Each structure stands twice: as C-alpha cells, then as structure tokens.
Design a protein around this ligand. Structure first.
Ligand SMILES: CCCCCCCCOCCOCCOCCOCCO
Length: 148
C-alpha cells in the first residue's frame, strides 16, 4: 500500500462578476499494491477580499471537501472523480458600519488526473465545481507532492 500527498495553487471563478479568487488545494490518495482502484480525498480553500475607495469591503471564502474513487491507468497516470460539499461565506460591509454576511453549503464535485514522472513524485491537476444557492463556483487546481 502507498499514499500520495499533493498540494498546490487553486483558483476559483464564479459565473456573475466575482473575479478570480486564489487559494490552495491538498489531496490525500491511498492505493493498494494489488488493485488499480483506490481512494482520494480533497480539501480546497479559496478567498478574495476587496476594499473600494468608497470604504466598502467584501470578503469571499470558498471551501470544498470532496472524495471519490481513483483509478491507476498505468505506472505514470491515474484518473479520479470526487463528490462532496462546498461551503461559501460572503462578507460585505457598506462603510462605515453596515455589515451583511451570508453562508451556505452546496453540492460539490470534481475530476482530475495525477501523473507520476518518477515513482515517488506526483503532479496533480483537477477541476472542482460547486453550486452554493444560485452561484456556480468553478476552481482549477495544479498541485505536486510525493507518493510513499
Ligand atoms: C472522472 C474520472 C473517472 C472517475 C474515476 C472512476 C474510477 C472508478 O474505477 C473505475 C474502474 O473500476 C475499478 C476496479 O476494481 C477492480 C480491480 O481488481 C481488484 C483486485 O482483484
């Protein structure tokens, strides 16, 4: 049995003018030595904050917790699909002191590929999609790590 731990930059974009929002992603994958089928869990977090000249301030945070099956195609490539929950927390302050916060969970799902350019190294690329209330958040991920 082996495990693969990867991490890297994540970047979210929602339909509706909610520009790019940067963060990170971590995945923990587990494989058995004698089956191509394993499991992978994924943690994603992005955020963006903005303060206008008017004094107004906005802060958006996105969390995605997903997991699913991972299939090893050959020695250097595997594919995976994940499902779970997405959480969005949106903070807004109308200067000087009017605040309004909203948060809610939604379904999240994703798919990715992991390459092993050397047996102990992993290059991970995935996309994650969540629907929180009516906003659709899409997040691209590129990570790296070790298999051990
Ligand atoms: C979106 C990407 C694809 C989603 C990955 C789904 C991968 C699920 O597995 C598909 C293949 O089925 C697995 C085989 O388990 C049997 C192996 O042999 C067992 C030991 O004797």
């Amino acid at each position: 049995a082996t495990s693969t731990v990867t991490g890297g930059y994540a970047q979210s974009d929602a339909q509706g003018q909610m520009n790019k929002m940067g963060g990170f992603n971590l995945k923990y994958r587990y494989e058995e030595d004698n089956s191509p089928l394993g499991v992978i869990g994924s943690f994603t977090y992005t955020e963006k904050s903005r303060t206008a000249s008017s004094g107004d301030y906005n802060k958006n945070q996105y969390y995605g917790i997903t997991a699913g099956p991972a299939y090893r195609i050959n020695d250097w490539a595997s594919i995976y699909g994940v499902v779970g929950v997405g959480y969005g927390k949106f903070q807004t302050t109308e200067y000087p002191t009017y605040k309004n916060d909203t948060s809610d969970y939604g379904f999240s799902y994703g798919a990715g590929l992991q390459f092993n350019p050397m047996e102990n190294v992993a290059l991970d690329f995935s996309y994650e999609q969540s629907r929180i209330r009516s906003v659709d958040v899409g997040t691209w991920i590129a990570g790296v790590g070790y298999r051990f």
